[PDB]
Design a binder for this molecule. Structure first.
Ligand SMILES: Clc1cccc(CN2CCOCC2)c1
Ligand SMILES: Clc1cccc(CN2CCOCC2)c1
Lengths: 304, 304
């Protein structure tokens, strides 16, 4: 019993983190097989960062300008290319600690763990969601660029995020491991405003199920609603619309608890309309939206 | 920028987790050098667990009754002893993945990471505090016993906790790695009530500093207070007393932010007296008490 914001064990990803230096800029790289992946802005002087031309800047760089250090041993760079907003440094040594892995592009509302790193060294691990506005609410200081987000399925690391930017509003933007930004962000020091940070409705419902399973039930009410009626309330409170796909995904939690999805929607509706009246749910005074239905099933069933 | 409930990277501890089976009971063990540490109740049939005599039960056990599996390879047990509430299984192989490590007994209010494990396999990592009543608010299902709590200082794992018990109230109890319980709990299926779960005042103040550093300042007020006056308010709200030791420990955060500790105490006092009036601090609607002053400095400075 008990429910915690839980990250994947980070060991498999720790063994992939390296330090990348170009000129005077140091950040983190991901060493998988004989390739190191890092943000392309490693080639920038923060001066460049106002309106950088990455193709033109990269002309002036050679394999031997990219200094790649795995612990305290230097990797020999034998090739470099740009793919979107990441650099791929071909090294002469396959990472012996390469786990089975995939690159995935996640959708907003999906959750992942971040291994926050500085100078190729892990500092900590926490669990995030891709916000509906394609930002993440991370903890990232200077030098944390190239820190990665991931999911683990048994022995297989799915890399979904690499850290690039902090917005002037202190929220974070980054790429998939093909270097394509989540959302409309560019790797440029410019005016970039995030859109509306809406609540991930299906995750809140999942977390209300998790609450019932763990004994927190005060918010269960006598009411039900419809998808359309619920979705009117959701829109008023900047909650994402709930789809039939979201209802289907919540089925197992529905099945386990014997509380129909639309009944739980009517409980959430009352919580939106009435607030918590100073009460708490799984030790939170707000509606948590960074657990997926899959996360609740996983944590509640004990999957390793 | 941004502030997250961050755990230590778990790799160093992942490589110490093994499966321990005695008769029909499987739980987790910690393999350090040529010793595996596990909860002694591994020798119990849940029948035993009502009033077990561990000395008498252990008479009936031999080295070859303790089945120790590290991944999918069996460890040869060449000795066993009981120290308090843990078993130490001497194996014939030193764990090649043994990190530099210490065993520490933490005090209430101190924080650590838990690697939740099932059948010797890591499932996830989260950050905890030892509650003032010597419980922890974990996420632990059957099979999670022998999961450990730890801190990392550069390359050195300090093990502070091993999981043993869930109380009928769904809070968790365990031992240091010498097998001594935190608090008055015994490894017996009996009536064990936790004491008052008070708030760790010094941690809330640390987290209010973390909030100011990250831009959340609405709660800063025009007031100051005294230690004695603050402590009257703390007692009314089941907050732990604030000592001069706590004030001294908050010094660096005081220094960085230029907000005197007693000024921040007067801000906390108003938050206790008036509540959040529907506002949030670092994305929480309650006062977070599972960051130490050390945790705020670490996360805010980027220590690896
Ligand atoms: Cl993370 C990711 C996101 C989108 C597509 C893909 C697959 N690739 C395969 C190679 O060429 C291009 C597409 C991966
Ligand atoms: Cl975790 C821990 C808690 C309390 C004391 C100690 C030190 N030991 C050294 C060996 O003998 C007994 C005491 C360790």
């Amino acid at each position: 019993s008990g429910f915690r914001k839980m990250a994947f064990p980070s060991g498999k990803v720790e063994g992939c983190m390296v330090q990348v230096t170009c000129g005077t800029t140091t950040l983190n790289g991901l060493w998988l097989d004989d390739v190191v992946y890092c943000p392309r802005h490693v080639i920038c002087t923060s001066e460049d960062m106002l309106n950088p031309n990455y193709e033109d800047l990269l002309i002036r760089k050679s394999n031997h300008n990219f200094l790649v250090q795995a612990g305290n041993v230097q990797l020999r760079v034998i090739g470099h290319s740009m793919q979107n907003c990441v650099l791929k440094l071909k090294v002469d040594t396959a990472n012996p600690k390469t786990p089975k892995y995939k690159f995935v592009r996640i959708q907003p509302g999906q959750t992942f763990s971040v291994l926050a790193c500085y100078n190729g060294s892990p500092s900590g691990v926490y669990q995030c969601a891709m916000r509906p506005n394609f930002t993440i609410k991370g903890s990232f200081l200077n030098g944390s660029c190239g820190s990665v987000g991931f999911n683990i399925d048994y022995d297989c690391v799915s890399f979904c995020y690499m850290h690039h930017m902090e917005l002037p509003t202190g929220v974070h933007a980054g790429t998939d491991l093909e270097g394509n930004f989540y959302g409309p962000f560019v790797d440029r020091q410019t005016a970039q405003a995030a859109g509306t940070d809406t609540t991930i409705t299906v995750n809140v419902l999942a977390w209300l199920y998790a609450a019932v399973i763990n004994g927190d039930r005060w918010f269960l009410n006598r009411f039900t609603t419809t998808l359309n009626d619920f979705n009117l309330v959701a829109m008023k409170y900047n909650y994402e619309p709930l789809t039939q796909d979201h209802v289907d995904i919540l089925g197992p939690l529905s099945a386990q608890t014997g509380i129909a999805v639309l009944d739980m929607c009517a409980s959430l509706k009352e919580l939106l309309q009435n607030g918590m009246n100073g009460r708490t749910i799984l030790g939170s005074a707000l509606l948590e939206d960074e657990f997926t239905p899959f996360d609740v099933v996983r944590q509640c069933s004990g999957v390793t």
